[PDB]
Amino acid sequence: HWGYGKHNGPEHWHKDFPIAKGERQSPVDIDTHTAKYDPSLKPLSVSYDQATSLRILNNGHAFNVEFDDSQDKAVLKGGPLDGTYRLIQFHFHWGSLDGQGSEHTVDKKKYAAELHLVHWNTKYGDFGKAVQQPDGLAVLGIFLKVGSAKPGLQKVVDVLDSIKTKGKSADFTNFDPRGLLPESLDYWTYPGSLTTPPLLECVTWIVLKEPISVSSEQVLKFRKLNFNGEGEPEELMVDNWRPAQPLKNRQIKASFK
Ligand SMILES: COc1cccc(NC(=O)Nc2ccc(S(N)(=O)=O)cc2)c1
Numbered sequence: 079h080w081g082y083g084k085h086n087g088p089e090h091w092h093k094d095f096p097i098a099k100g101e102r103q104s105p106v107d108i109d110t111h112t113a114k115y116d117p118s119l120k121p122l123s124v125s126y127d128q129a130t131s132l133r134i135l136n137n138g139h140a141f142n143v144e145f146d147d148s149q150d151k152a153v154l155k156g157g158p159l160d161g162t163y164r165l166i167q168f169h170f171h172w173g174s175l176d177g178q179g180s181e182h183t184v185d186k187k188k189y190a191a192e193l194h195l196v197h198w199n200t201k202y203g204d205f206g207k208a209v210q211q212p213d214g215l216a217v218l219g220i221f222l223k224v225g226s227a228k229p230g231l232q233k234v235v236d237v238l239d240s241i242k243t244k245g246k247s248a249d250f251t252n253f254d255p256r257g258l259l260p261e262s263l264d265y266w267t268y269p270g271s272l273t274t275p276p277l278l279e280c281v282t283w284i285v286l287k288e289p290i291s292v293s294s295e296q297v298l299k300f301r302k303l304n305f306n307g308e309g310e311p312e313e314l315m316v317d318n319w320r321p322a323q324p325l326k327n328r329q330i331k332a333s334f335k
Pocket residue numbers: 142144166167194196205217271272273274275
């Protein structure tokens with residue numbers, strides 16, 4: 079089964095998921111000098127005041143904070159998007175060391191980690207139908223650098239002890255994702271894919287320019303999680319990132335001058 083080891087990591091995925099070598103795969107390097115300001119882009123609209131988190135799950139590749147998406151509560155609109163996209167989960171990708179861990183890079187710079195807030199287009203009715211469409215998903219990507227602590231992240235960090243191994247979950251209500259956003263919503267955007275199998279080409283990527291700062295102690299607790307299940311040999315959950323993929327026939331657009 080796929081993962082991030084030497085025998086099953088990203089260079090192997092194309093054997094079970096041939097779309098891995100496709101025309102709109104993610105992540106990519108963001109070359110800041112080639113991304114063109116697009117004055118037709120609108121400001122992002124992030125409406126998370128009514129978000130309802132339910133649960134946190136270690137799925138063996140990352141941990142997902144899951145939301146109730148049965149009504150239009152926490153939604154992403156505007157920016158490059160047409161229509162309304164509903165928040166379903168967020169998760170992170172991170173490194174074994176502070177010098178790597180993000181999936182997108184900026185002028186080849188790797189950040190310590192990257193947050194993905196995953197939303198689906200309500201015109202397709204459910205997430206499973208949305209991922210079959212080229213405009214089915216919108217993922218908001220936020221870089222993490224190591225410095226000062228992020229207070230709004232600490233409630234996530236403190237529950238990770240209870241979901242150390244694959245398949246463990248814990249109740250996780252009343253978490254406010256507004257506490258994970260940077261001050262500025264300036265962004266880059268391009269058409270891409272899921273960055274894990276099945277690597278479907280269904281995502282409008284919206285990557286914020288401003289990273290958030292987290293503390294060394296916070297990211298250290300990410301790195302104590304396990305890829306393995308309970309009672310299996312311990313394999314630390316680190317370096318769960320896909321490297322940058324070819325840009326091919328795509329343009330990255332900037333919302334800012
Ligand atoms: C309970 O919550 C669910 C329920 C059903 C599906 C999912 N998500 C999923 O299947 N895949 C996914 C999402 C984003 C990315 S990524 N790294 O490109 O942002 C990669 C893969 C979550």
